Amino acid sequence: NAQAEEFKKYLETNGIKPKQFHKKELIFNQWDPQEYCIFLYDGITKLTSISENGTIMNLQYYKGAFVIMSGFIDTETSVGYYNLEVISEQATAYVIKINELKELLSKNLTHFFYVFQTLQKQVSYSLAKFNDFSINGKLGSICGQLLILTYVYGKETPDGIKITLDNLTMQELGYSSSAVSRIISKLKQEKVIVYKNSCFYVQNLDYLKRYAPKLDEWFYLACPATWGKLN
Amino acid sequence: NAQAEEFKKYLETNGIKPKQFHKKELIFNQWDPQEYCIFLYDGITKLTSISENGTIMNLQYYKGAFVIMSGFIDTETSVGYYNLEVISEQATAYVIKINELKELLSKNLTHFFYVFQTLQKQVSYSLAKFNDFSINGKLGSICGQLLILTYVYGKETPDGIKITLDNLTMQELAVSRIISKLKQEKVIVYKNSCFYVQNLDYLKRYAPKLDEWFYLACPATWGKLN
Ligand SMILES: NC(=O)CC[C@H](N)C(=O)O
Ligand SMILES: [Cl-]
Ligand SMILES: [Cl-]
């Protein structure tokens, strides 16, 4: 969608050129002292964290049109020690040094507001996930994850709502852990979801909405174009 | 925060007056169609949510100084249906309509950046909590909440690090058992009615990404007890 399309144009007129990235590649890593503003234009990515013994923790997933910042704009100090890994086959992104971003948004307030809103989206998304987790536990978390998958990559055809994520990206969010299985197993049993033609389908959406009401509220409030397509 | 001190001054020169709030009092509620920007200057608050069946869910806690926004800056639409309840005895806050903020920040960039950071702060805090929960489960969650309590309201005295939260706020707080284990290992202790910290390392062990966040987000305060 568009506010982001205007930003892409803005960055290009200001000399920031797009860069191509592939699967498993890192846009930025934990140890990089250079702080950035990553305008992920197209693709899917994950924000990871490496514990001191080396175990990799998946923290957040971002889709292609979004901003990710490893530095604070005011102080230009690290927001945290993270890695921004690419998950999709290919991804396009504009890598900007945190200090240029300061200037680009200073010059242009429409874009300052766009990036500012994205943070507001991030904050509220987290609170929505958390609310649903607090009420329904792991069930709320899963339905929530399935609901975002549904709205963002779903389209209606005879056999329910098809998740159009290349199953290779869904192996990074498994078809296949086992209380998840207790849940995912139950959802298959109830005909809420179905695994038939190497794709996951959704046959009971009202159910997902029921057990992920705050996330459902978030989509409607944060990005209403996407929410309206299935409502 | 000096940055927040400058913001207080800015809002007052711009005619926004401070308002006093007491315990259980709501700055804003979920049914208010007016979106706001709450510059919580002094006090402690909680961001709650009421489920359709009436059950109250505590989602996040905020300390005086910080900004909380119920609306998106440009579109001016609800960010979510929440309540901002006061939990401390008394709280001071500048309640500003969202549209007012839009015009206010548009005329001073230093302050636009300050509020923008606050969001960045929030985002990374959530990811830190989550990382620690993902590794250590609720043990990571509790050590994390105890670590926050320690750094923000802790002071060194002979019997460990004293949590200087009026016990009344400490009641705002299956297994009381983690906490039992912590009390057994002399990580924390509950005489004299206060909560002490004897093994700050244990908390940092199981909530390590939260510790990292406090080091980067509040460095001066972090270096006080380290
Ligand atoms: N000074 C503060 O209250 C910081 C708040 C912190 N970012 C939080 O999410 O709780
Ligand atoms: Cl996510
Ligand atoms: Cl919190």
Curated annotation (Swiss-Prot), chain B:
Entry GO MF terms: DNA binding; DNA-binding transcription factor activity
Stored SUPFAM superfamilies: cAMP-binding domain-like (SSF51206), Winged helix' DNA-binding domain (SSF46785)
Claim: Glycosyltransferase is one of the keywords in the record: no
Superkingdom of origin organism: Bacteria
Keywords linked to the UniProt accession: Activator, DNA-binding, Transcription, Transcription regulation, Virulence
Gene Ontology terms: cellular component: cytosol
InterPro entries: cNMP-bd_dom_sf, HTH_CRP, RmlC-like_jellyroll, Tscrpt_reg_HTH_Crp-type_CS, WH-like_DNA-bd_sf, WH_DNA-bd_sf
Residues of the HTH crp-type domain: 136-201
Protein's job: Positively regulates expression of listeriolysin, of 1-phosphadidylinositol phosphodiesterase (PI-PLC) and other virulence factors.
Protein name per its UniProtKB record: Listeriolysin regulatory protein
Protein's organism: Listeria monocytogenes serovar 1/2a (strain ATCC BAA-679 / EGD-e)
